[PDB]
Amino acid sequence: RTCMIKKEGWGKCLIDTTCAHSCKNRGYIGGNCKGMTRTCYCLVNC
Numbered sequence: 001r002t003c004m005i006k007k008e009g010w011g012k013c014l015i016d017t018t019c020a021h022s023c024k025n026r027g028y029i030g031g032n033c034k035g036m037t038r039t040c041y042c043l044v045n046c
Helices: 017-027
Strands: 003-006 030-034 039-044
Touching: 003 030, 017 030, 017 039
Parallel strands: none
Antiparallel strands: 003 039, 030 039
């Protein structure tokens, strides 16, 4: 399982993994990039 948050403090996202990168490195399973708000999300083992 996993939970994603909004990593808007990192800067909008251009792809779908670009955000996941910062997420993992931060300590997450991955992340996402919402086009509706161009923000970076990060999934964690939640």
